[PDB]
């Protein structure tokens, strides 16, 4: 993560209590003032860091991180400055929602930078509650019963995500098969619009394992673009204005390499 607030993530390998070791992005010596590298790790004093629902989350929306405490009966965070100042522990006027499960945990639709959980699927909509790192009551709503129902967590050659194909900035619910894409308009509290299909995507249903897809916007517009793995090549699908999709770019992998279930693709601004 970018714990330091570089505007660039650092590689904070961490293994055990204390193993917090930030391989950090550094300018290369020589050349244009563009060349950058991950320098060596560093150790810094840190929380016991375990059994706690560990994560370097900014819970408050500062742009600057806390670390989550959620052990059995044990609940709050610390805050960490760019200096690495792990502030003293913070009980939180604590009233987080009961964690039944992570399954279908919402984030965005409370409003940008205000993220909060909702656990949800068909015919109902729990309400988010986060303000500024505290929470309201987690109220109940539903949209109108005609509205098509988005629901996370089936592997059958299919995916669901909170990710903005549309590029408004709202990481809309989108559902993907081997063959089609549908996306639900943001409607705020407890509500969604009838979904829009986005034309153009497909893949052979014989072989479309869902996880071979990758989610990023590439064009820089905001419209989330699409990538799919062949063992030799990437198929890259670019979002037409948030409406449909271009002919896929086919990209040859590094020579002799083959992509496989070990491989982890990502995109980043290293």
């Amino acid at each position: 993560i970018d714990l330091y607030g570089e505007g660039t993530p650092g590689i904070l390998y961490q293994e055990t209590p204390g193993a917090w070791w930030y391989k950090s992005p550094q300018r290369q010596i020589g050349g244009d003032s563009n060349a950058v590298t991950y320098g060596a790790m560093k150790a810094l004093p840190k929380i016991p860091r375990l059994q706690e629902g560990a994560t370097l989350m900014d819970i408050n929306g500062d742009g600057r991180l806390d670390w989550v405490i959620t052990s059995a009966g044990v609940r709050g965070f610390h805050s960490i400055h760019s200096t690495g100042e792990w502030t003293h522990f913070t009980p939180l006027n604590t009233l987080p929602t009961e964690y039944f499960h992570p399954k279908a945990q919402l984030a965005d639709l409370v409003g940008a930078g205000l993220s909060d959980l909702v656990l949800i699927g068909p015919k109902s909509v729990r309400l988010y509650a986060n303000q500024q790192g505290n929470w309201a009551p987690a109220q109940d709503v539903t949209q109108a019963e005609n509205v098509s129902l988005p629901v996370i967590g089936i592997d059958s050659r299919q995916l669901v995500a909170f990710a903005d194909m549309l590029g408004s900035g709202q990481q809309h619910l989108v559902e993907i098969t081997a063959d089609s894409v549908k996306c639900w308009p943001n409607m705020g509290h407890g509500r969604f619009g009838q979904p829009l299909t986005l034309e153009g995507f497909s893949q052979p249903q014989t072989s479309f394992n869902p996880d071979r897809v990758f989610l990023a916007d590439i064009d820089g517009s905001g419209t989330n673009d699409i990538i799919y793995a062949h063992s030799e090549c990437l198929e890259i699908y670019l979002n037409e204005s948030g409406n449909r999709f271009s002919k896929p770019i086919s990209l040859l992998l590094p020579d002799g390499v083959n992509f496989d279930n070990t491989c982890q693709l990502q995109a980043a601004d290293i």
Binding site: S207, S231, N258, D260
Partner: peptide, 28 residues
């Protein structure tokens, strides 16, 4: 050792390589 696939319909072009794992015990 001998190794072979058995389902004939299944595509195999996906295959990169095979890695074995062995637990063994030893004297000194």
């Amino acid at each position: 050792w001998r190794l072979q696939f058995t389902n004939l319909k299944q595509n195999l072009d996906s295959l990169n390589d095979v890695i074995l794992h062995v637990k063994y015990t030893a004297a000194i």
